[PDB]
Amino acid sequence: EWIWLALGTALMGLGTLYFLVKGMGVSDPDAKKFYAITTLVPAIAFTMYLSMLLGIYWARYASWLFTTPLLLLDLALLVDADQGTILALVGADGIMIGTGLVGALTKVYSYRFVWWAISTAAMLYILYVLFFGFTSKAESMRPEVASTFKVLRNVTVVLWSAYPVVWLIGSEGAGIVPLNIETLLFMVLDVSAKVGFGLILLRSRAIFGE
Numbered sequence: 001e002w003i004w005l006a007l008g009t010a011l012m013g014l015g016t017l018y019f020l021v022k023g024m025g026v027s028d029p030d031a032k033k034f035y036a037i038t039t040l041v042p043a044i045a046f047t048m049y050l051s052m053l054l055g056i057y058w059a060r061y062a063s064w065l066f067t068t069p070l071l072l073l074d075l076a077l078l079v080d081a082d083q084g085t086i087l088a089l090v091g092a093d094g095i096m097i098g099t100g101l102v103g104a105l106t107k108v109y110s111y112r113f114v115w116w117a118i119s120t121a122a123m124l125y126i127l128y129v130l131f132f133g134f135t136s137k138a139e140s141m142r143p144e145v146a147s148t149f150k151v152l153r154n155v156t157v158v159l160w161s162a163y164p165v166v167w168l169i170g171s172e173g174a175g176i177v178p179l180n181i182e183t184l185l186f187m188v189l190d191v192s193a194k195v196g197f198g199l200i201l202l203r204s205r206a207i208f209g210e
């Protein structure tokens, strides 16, 4: 298990580093914003994984809290979403992570069930907006934006959807998957949803205003 935390810490660190060095010199106003957000995401995750190496897993949970909203912000800027829609998204994301925590805090099966069901519901509203709401908006924009958004959209829906699955069969849910393997799983997902995500976005010309 120490290997998963170490490997994760290194991958987040190197990603943050790459994104950080790549964005320097880049003078495009529009582009600089994507770099700021995208470098911050893996920087926050790196800090938490490094903390776990020195340390339970609620640390990684705290990182989801800060990062998921930023990843959503990245997507919203890509398709030039209006203020209202962004707020609703981050609001629902806040409920997703918040109720996920509340339920993992209640011992009675029935109460918890509802918290994690409410959490999943908020997650589905988010993915619905991204898939249906954001896609229509993206297709009315520059080809580069439409195309890069579609990939980031597909990566996000698949990866994000896997979290509740792992969690339910893991030590927090049914207790099927061992605590060490669960850690393996979440690190791969996290590295994918942030570094893999950032790589796709930042190596694309869609971030420039033109």
Ligand SMILES: *C/C=C(C)/C=C/C=C(C)/C=C/C1=C(C)CCCC1(C)C
Binding pocket: 045, 063, 064, 067, 068, 071, 096, 097, 100, 101, 116, 119, 120, 121, 123, 160, 161, 163, 164, 167, 189, 190, 193, 194
């Ligand atoms: C870098 C980290 C990312 C992208 C983390 C994403 C986490 C989620 C989408 C978590 C979702 C959950 C539910 C929908 C139900 C309750 C349990 C959670 C918190 C695992």
